[PDB]
Design a protein around this ligand. Structure first.
Ligand code: ATP
Ligand code: ATP
Ligand code: ATP
Ligand code: MG
Ligand code: MG
Ligand code: MG
Lengths: 362, 432, 605, 52, 99
DNA sequence: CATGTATTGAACAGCGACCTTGCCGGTGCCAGTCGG
DNA sequence: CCGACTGGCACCGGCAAGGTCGCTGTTCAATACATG
């Protein structure tokens, strides 16, 4: 008998696949394009940009344009997965502390637009913790659009202790354009920006000692790696390589007043009950695409060890799948026998309304 | 008939205090959003949340609440409550289309119930509903006192609430969910005063102890007890303001409060002849300041707290104008005065239903000592202490009470309607 | 009181048609006899699903892959082998990367072999322990070669020492110098499709000492592991192994246009006792940095038997700095058999120079961290070292020290027994400088913990290796602490003892498996190319286990190949053959990182 | 794994059959305080399911 | 004007007394029990989920046996490859450096 | 041409260990009946 | 609205029981290889 579906509603990239699978079937940009003067989604919308206004329907991890979001799910089911929701239960991920109204509205849409039989909404941080191997820990989830720190104890995510660094993978791309423009290259265009995001994904890393790297970058040849544009001209970038990710650790470097990921991790831990903190320092878990920079774990280990009491073991769990951990945890959850007595049935929706999600999903 | 779904009313419950402010939707076991009441100021620009306090040239740390646990800066109160109830708990408005890099009134849904300190004066209650009705378009409003909600967070209709806050320690008798007005008793001997005690005690050990806050250390290495710390401190392109340093040091005083200090729990006060001499021999508790400065703490661990139980024990204030605590402002004096403000016939019922509340009650041994003190000051009566809360986390007791109150279907008849306010102006006094 | 008076006043209590409460009521889950559908079928595991899709598509194309588009890489502390799977022999380059820097590698550290210059006596100058051990080994050889009834003139060492002391360099230039030899012109631009003036391989060694901009050489691999001793930071090390392999693709294979690389596939050979962090680094280079379509891993001894065509063998790999032993049977390296010793043909060179220096080798100023001295030392090692206890006598020879921008100096010299004692260090490894091999061994890159239980080490462990560690340091602590305590010991043992402790753990107590493996010894790796290494090792094994002396049989290389290339040739066969479904595809790795190595490899990773 | 009886109650009982769920809409509700004054809360509604 | 009435006082008090004694106590019990059950559900679920996430890595006899077979398949094929290059025809790529 | 074999890759059958919830004897706290 | 007394349900540790799962084992047609 046929499997349930798992959809990860990313600010940057949407991911979808069948429960039980260990990786998504479909990964495509969360872009909807409508004519300037039909609509297109994902790579098509980027390709046909010349005749389209493009908008993201998800901003800072949260859905903001429902009429567009419904088109992304339509593309997900009918073009990407090639399966009709009328025969499959669905698990949707959502960002931590998203508004109640958004839980209700996405409940409304996968019943009333897609006639899905039974469905469940799930906190992205928690799922990334399941995929990371454990029941208790603190999840730094850092995506394209937003960065959250979420303490979770005995599989319950503490809402009050969540801290949101409003800065993430797009900001680091805007920033890497900025510092390369200062170096001498031109990258103002959207068809240039989508090159710079690839440059960020390949060449960047996080320094273990930022001041020492700045001091030695003035003389080292090794640092200055080079990258071919589609245009055929070749760029070279140097201290830009680490100054782009370093903004995670020093958001002043790109001009906002929030504390870095390390201080926000520490503050989230410190907002927890004293008895729990031993376990959270022992179980820091990294999630989401922005956490993929080489050596982010080593620097998180260093920085939090500098903030923590010298008695605390500090442990940074960075699984190799951490780019898709949010989806993978969903896969797992939607493929336990237990799921059936945990979802919203259409028979419940039909007499409870969208507000059933506030009972049933917790 | 039977056209409606599974939902009643998505109320949200707001709970301001001197140290912290708490907000979120009714019918959840914890508030969604808890923030430092202390708010950032930089350059005519106000900043909120513990993620947005950091060293910057202009940075100054204000608070919209005074040490009476009442609002003193209603403009900032409006901005803070709008950050909680609007920016963090409602759907975002989408970006304009050009600005996304690809191309090249708010509370009408949710009634607001708000928490007030027991002694909060009518003028401040009037201004609360006035601010609410202008600024967010809210459909209905209600205002209720922390003791009443704290009792509901323990499940008790009638209770003695001991409420050991930050800026204030309070005792009050709750009966059938009303406060018995004569019983309200209040004291500075609370988590803020206790920080001053700890500061004083540090500035008076044989080598003086210097707190240095977490933000000023770049790197630290472990060191043996009482050694000079292997560390390197920061420097900045600007002076750090005194308000900022004071706020960032309070974290360390909170860490010392929670992980070291311990209420004297043995028989009799700490200053009875044998007790101090005994305490000096015991295994203590260890602590680390952010500097790396490591020490084992033996007998002071009790004394810093003991002053709120017997003023005789208290250290002198570091601020010379912060006058010493009177006998009448010690916890047993509060308790005895509070209960003596209540009908003699009701006293056993209250004492059987003791509710403890507030983060300062999370001192090790606080329930022990309070059980002893209640026993010895009211002999021949049963005593049973309860924490406010549904969980180990007894921090949120006032809030959780609101969450529960606004979820009771019987309650929704009580709200001050938008339409009542816009017809009467000061309903808030008499409809209570 | 009052009753209907309340209603007349307009005051009336009211439930508002609401429920008695709105607090969530939650039904408890039941998990009795629970089941899971997660990763239960090949359909669901991405690494297998993609392979089934590739199998189906191959069957369809058959009804109606290219060795020239498979690259085979085999890294090493002195040498990198690289080539296409089509190719008869791999191109070999010194795995060294040269860059502009403030100080050359000779200026940063004490000279090698290490000496206490201006020491109070020559016995202190070379270290007293070491001098006693050299004297032992000289006497041991004299007794041994007298037992074999060779000629020994009593004055042998004196004839060498006095001659080497009294002789002085001749000086030659122009057509009097046999070679008009070049130095790398670091000023000239790279024509191989790139901007940065960096050099690899033989050309990097041939950078003059006083080049106009100063160049420092770096080796990213030493002692058969990542060379964290030298590198300031992790990123700088990764960036150099990336830069070296990048230039090797460009400058040896001639794949100059980078955009074409996405259509190629790659086979990487890794040691039998690998660090997981080194395997996962090499994967990540091959996919995020080079964007190659497929990557596959084969273990050095596994590959060695694929180079021979052996079902079952004991493979002894004697590298420049690593010697490793493991026993192969039924398509796997036997997990517990693996032994990994931190010595090889470089130690023989250092030791060879140090023994001649102590005797009286003319160029006392020599320093193996200086490039032309390094090449000198290595050339002499390859010519004069021999484990054959024969044709050994006072012999006179000469070499040229073609220093950079300085006249060619020719030294006559003599040797007697340093030429055999230095190699024989493989049977008393204390004679080697092992003092700093363990230096910085976890300075940058931590030990490989398990993905989820991050205390627990997840590197390979082998009973045979622990037997070797116990011989150096006799051996409730956590598994982390135990692994740390083991890493603090440098694995060292005589080569015969290492082989027999390998084989005993391969057999797990079965004389018949012992009698097969001991009769099946195959020697590979360049250190093995010291003349008569295989027969000498057969002798040493015979005399430690007389119970096996009729079956013990050692063979050099396989099927006429050079010892160096066998493992490469084998890894090419694993590229070419059709049954191999071991490939990590590029799309797998993008989706699931190193997790897919566990799903795909042909052993328990 | 999947079978009959308990432990698969939901996976047997789910609808799978395309039929429309009842359409919800953001209606309103008249709420009456104990002081008799009436005020409006936004509340979900759907059309009545038919007679047996 | 509005709220000084004895009647108002009675209803206000009666609402609050019933709300405090009956409804707050019912809802307290229900909320505490509901929290305990929610926490239990999530604990139970997280324990299963976290086991599954790791389960693929645990060695099994069947997994071991099939892996040994995959190795042995490849090994026989490798012997076949050499048979097709030494027995089917002697097809060695003899080569020299020609320096 | 085409006799003859142990092993292969797999479907199918068998057994005990395992995790979890039901039913159980018992201690305890509680809502409700009754009198006032 | 209130307390004393009663029958009842919540909770404790404990043993009996369930199916899933992993370990164990027999049997089949098809295979590469050998003598013949
Ligand atoms: N290997 C990588 N190195 C660096 N950055 C990466 C890497 N892979 C992806 N990213 C970046 O991570 C972001 C995408 O991550 P992810 O898909 O988790 O975001 P998302 O979930 O859509 O965002 P959000 O969680 O905010 O909704 C992009 O900015 C992308 O460029
Ligand atoms: N674990 C702890 N142990 C003791 N004191 C603590 C602990 N955690 C926090 N505190 C202190 O108690 C106060 C926390 O705020 P709390 O809710 O208890 O009071 P508040 O409601 O913010 O202020 P108030 O009621 O006085 O207006 C602070 O003074 C804080 O330093
Ligand atoms: N012709 C030769 N004769 C003798 N010895 C040689 C010859 N050529 C090289 N060697 C020696 O053999 C050593 C081993 O070379 P090889 O290329 O196997 O190193 P390697 O495989 O990189 O070692 P490792 O893999 O452990 O780093 C060389 O370092 C050199 O000292
Ligand atoms: Mg995401
Ligand atoms: Mg308070
Ligand atoms: Mg080698």
């Amino acid at each position: 008998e046929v499997a349930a579906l798992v959809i990860d509603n990313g600010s940057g990239m949407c991911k979808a696949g069948f429960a039980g699978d260990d990786a998504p079937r479909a990964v495509f940009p969360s872009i909807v394009g409508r004519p300037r003067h039909d609509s297109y989604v994902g790579d098509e919308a980027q390709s046909k940009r010349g005749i389209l206004t493009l908008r993201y329907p998800i901003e800072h991890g949260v859905v903001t344009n429902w009429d567009d979001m419904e088109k992304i799910w339509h593309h997900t089911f009918y073009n990407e997965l090639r399966v009709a929701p009328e025969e499959h239960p669905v698990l949707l991920t959502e960002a931590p502390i998203n508004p109640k109204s958004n839980r209700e509205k996405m409940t409304q849409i996968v019943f009333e637009t897609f006639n899905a039989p039974a469905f469940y909404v799930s906190i992205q941080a928690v799922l990334s913790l399941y995929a990371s191997g454990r029941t208790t820990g603190i999840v730094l989830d850092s995506g394209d659009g937003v960065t959250h720190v979420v303490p979770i104890y005995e599989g319950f995510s503490l809402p009050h202790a969540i801290a949101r660094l409003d800065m993430a993978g797009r900001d680091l791309t805007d920033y890497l354009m900025k510092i390369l423009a200062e170096r001498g290259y031109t990258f103002s265009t959207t068809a240039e920006r989508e090159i710079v995001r690839d440059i960020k994904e390949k060449l960047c890393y996080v320094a273990l000692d930022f001041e020492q790297e700045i001091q030695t970058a003035a003389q080292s040849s090794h640092l200055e790696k080079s990258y071919e544009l589609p245009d055929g001209q070749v760029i070279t970038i140097g201290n830009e390589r680490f100054r782009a990710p370093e903004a995670l650790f020093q958001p002043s470097v790109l001009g906002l007043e929030s504390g870095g990921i390390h201080v926000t991790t520490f503050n989230s831990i410190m907002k927890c009950d004293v008895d729990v903190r031993k376990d959270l320092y022992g179980n820091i878990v990294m999630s989401g695409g922005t956490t993929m920079y080489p050596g982010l774990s080593d620097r998180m280990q260093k920085e939090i060890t500098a903030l923590a009491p010298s008695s605390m073991k500090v442990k940074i769990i960075a699984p190799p799948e951490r780019k898709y951990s949010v989806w993978i945890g969903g896969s797992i959850l939607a493929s336990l026998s237990t799921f059936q007595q945990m979802w919203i049935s259409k028979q419940e929706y039909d007499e409870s309304g969208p507000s059933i999600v506030h009972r049933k999903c917790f | 008939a039977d056209i409606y779904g599974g939902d009643e009313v998505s109320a949200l419950v707001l709970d301001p205090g001197y140290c912290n402010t708490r907000a979120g939707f009714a019918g959840e076991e914890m508030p969604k959003q808890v923030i430092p009441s202390f708010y950032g100021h930089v350059d005519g620009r106000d900043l909120f949340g513990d993620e947005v306090i950091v060293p910057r040239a202009g940075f100054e740390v204000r608070n919209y609440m005074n040490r009476d646990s009442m609002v003193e800066d209603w403009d900032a109160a409006t901005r803070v409550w709008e950050y909680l109830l609007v920016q963090r708990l409602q759907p975002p408005r989408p970006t304009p289309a050009s600005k996304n890099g690809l191309n090249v009134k708010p509370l009408t849904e949710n009634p607001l119930l708000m928490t007030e300190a027991p002694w909060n004066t009518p003028k401040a209650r009037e201004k609360a509903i006035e601010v609410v009705m202008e600024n967010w378009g809210t459909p209905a409003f209600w205002l209720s006192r922390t003791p009443v909600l704290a009792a509901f967070a323990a499940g008790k209709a009638t209770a003695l609430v001991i409420d050991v806050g930050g800026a204030n320690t309070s005792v009050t008798a709750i009966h059938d969910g009303m406060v018995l007005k004569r019983s309200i008793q209040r004291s500075p001997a609370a988590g803020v005063w206790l920080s001053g005690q700890i500061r004083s005690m540090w500035k008076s050990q044989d080598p003086p102890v210097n707190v240095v806050p977490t933000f000023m250390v770049e790197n630290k290495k472990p060191v043996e007890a009482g050694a000079p710390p292997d560390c390197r401190l920061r420097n900045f392109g600007f002076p750090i303001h005194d308000s900022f340093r004071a706020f960032e040091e309070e974290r360390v005083l909170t860490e010392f409060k929670e992980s070291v200090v311990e209420v004297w729990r043995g028989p009799g006060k700490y200053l009875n002849p044998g007790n101090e001499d005994f305490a000096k021999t015991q295994p203590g508790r260890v602590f680390e300041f952010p500097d790396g400065s490591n020490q084992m703490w033996r007998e002071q661990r009790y004394r810093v707290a003991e002053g709120m139980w017997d003023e005789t024990a208290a250290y002198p204030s570091l601020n010379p104008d912060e006058a010493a605590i009177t006998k009448a402002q010690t916890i047993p004096a509060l308790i005895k005065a509070a209960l003596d403000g209540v009908d003699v016939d009701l006293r056993p019922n209250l004492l059987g239903n003791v509710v403890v509340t507030g983060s300062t009650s999370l001192l090790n041994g606080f329930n022990d000592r309070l059980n002893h003190e209640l026993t010895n000051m009211y002999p021949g009566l049963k005593i049973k202490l309860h924490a406010a809360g549904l969980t180990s986390e007894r921090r949120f007791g006032a809030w959780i009470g609101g969450s529960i109150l606004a979820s009771l279907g019987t309650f929704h008849q009580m709200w001050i309607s938008r339409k009542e306010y816009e017809e009467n102006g000061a309903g808030i006094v008499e409809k209570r | 009181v009052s009753e209907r008076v309340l209603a007349r006043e307009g005051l009336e209590r009211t439930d508002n048609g609401m429920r008695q409460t709105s607090w969530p009521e939650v039904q408890p889950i039941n998990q009795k006899n629970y089941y899971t559908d997660y990763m239960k079928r090949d359909d669901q595991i991405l690494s297998l699903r993609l392979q089934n899709e590739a199998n189906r598509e191959r069957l369809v194309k058959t009804a109606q892959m290219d060795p020239s588009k498979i690259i085979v890489i085999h890294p090493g502390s002195q040498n990198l082998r690289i080539g296409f799977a089509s190719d008869a022999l791999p191109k070999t380059i010194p795995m060294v990367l040269g860059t502009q820097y403030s100080q050359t590698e000779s200026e940063m550290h004490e000279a090698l072999p290490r000496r206490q210059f201006e020491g109070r006596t020559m016995e202190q100058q070379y270290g007293e322990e070491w001098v006693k051990k050299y004297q032992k080994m000289c006497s041991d050889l004299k007794v041994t070669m007298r037992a074999n009834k060779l000629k020994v003139l009593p004055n042998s060492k004196d004839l060498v020492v006095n001659f080497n002391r009294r002789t002085e360099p001749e000086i030659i230039s122009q057509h009097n110098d046999p070679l008009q030899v070049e130095w790398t012109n670091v000023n000239k631009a790279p024509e191989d499709g790139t901007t940065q003036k960096v050099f690899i391989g033989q050309q990097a060694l041939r950078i003059a000492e006083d080049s106009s901009p100063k160049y420092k050489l770096w080796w990213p691999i030493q002692h058969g592991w990542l060379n964290e001793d030298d590198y300031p930071t992790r990123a700088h090390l990764f960036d150099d192994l990336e830069m070296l392999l990048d230039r090797a693709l460009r400058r040896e294979l001639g794949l100059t246009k980078k955009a074409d690389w996405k259509q190629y596939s790659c086979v990487i050979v890794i040691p039998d006792l690998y660090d997981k962090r080194y395997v996962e680094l090499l994967l990540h280079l091959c996919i995020e940095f080079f964007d190659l379509s497929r990557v596959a891993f084969i273990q050095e001894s596994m590959a060695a038997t694929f180079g021979a065509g052996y079902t079952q063998a004991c493979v002894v790999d004697v590298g420049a700095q690593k010697t490793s032993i493991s026993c192969v049977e039924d398509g796997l390296v036997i997990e517990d058999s693996r032994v990994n010793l931190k010595y090889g043909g470089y130690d023989v060179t250092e030791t060879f120079i140090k023994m001649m220096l102590y005797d009286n080798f003319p160029y006392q100023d020599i320093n193996l961290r200086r490039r032309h001295d390094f090449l000198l030392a290595e050339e002499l090692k390859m010519k004069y070292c021999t484990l054959s206890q024969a044709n050994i006598s006072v012999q006179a020879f000469d070499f040229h020290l073609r220093a950079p921008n300085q006249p060619t100096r020719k030294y006559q010299f003599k040797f007697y027994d340093e030429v055999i004692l230095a190699p024989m260090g493989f049977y008393d490894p204390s004679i080697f400088d092992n003092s700093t091999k363990l230096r910085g061994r976890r300075k940058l890159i931590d030990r490989s913990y398990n993905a989820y239980d991050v205390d627990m080490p997840d590197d390979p462990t082998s009973s045979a290796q622990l037997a070797i560690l116990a011989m150096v340091q006799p051996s409730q602590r956590s598994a982390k602490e135990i692994a740390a305590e083991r890493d603090a010991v440098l694995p060292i043992a005589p080569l015969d003892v290492a082989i027999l402790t390998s084989i005993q753990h391969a057999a797990k107590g079965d004389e018949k498996k012992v009698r097969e493996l001991v009769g099946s010894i195959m020697v590979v790796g360049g250190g093995a190319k010291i003349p008569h290494f295989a027969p000498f090792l057969e002798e040493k094994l015979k005399i430690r286990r007389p119970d096996l002396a009729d079956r013990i049989l050692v063979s050099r290389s396989a099927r006429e190949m050079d010892e160096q290339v066998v493992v490469w040739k084998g890894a090419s066969v694993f590229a070419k053959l059709s049954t191999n479904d071991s490939w990590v595809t590029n799309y797998e790795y993008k989706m699931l990182g190193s997790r897919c190595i566990y799903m795909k490899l042909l052993w328990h990773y | 794994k999947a079978n009959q009886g308990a432990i698969n109650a939901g996976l047997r009982a789910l609808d799978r059959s395309g039929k429309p769920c009842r359409k919800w809409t953001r209606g309103t509700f008249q709420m009456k305080s104990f002081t008799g004054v009436v005020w409006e809360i936004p509340r979900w509604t759907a059309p009545p399911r038919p007679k047996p | 004007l509005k709220f000084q009435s004895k009647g108002y006082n009675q209803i206000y008090d009666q609402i609050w007394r019933d709300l405090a004694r009956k409804d707050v106590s019912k809802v307290f019990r229900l909320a505490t029990d509901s929290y305990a059950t929610k926490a239990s559900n999530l604990k139970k679920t997280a324990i299963l989920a976290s086991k599954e996430a790791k389960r693929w890595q645990l060695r099994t006899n069947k997994g071991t046996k099939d892996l040994q077979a995959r190795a042995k398949r490849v090994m026989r094929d490798m012997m076949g490859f050499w048979k097709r290059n030494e027995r089917e025809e002697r097809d060695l790529r003899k080569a020299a450096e020609r320096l």
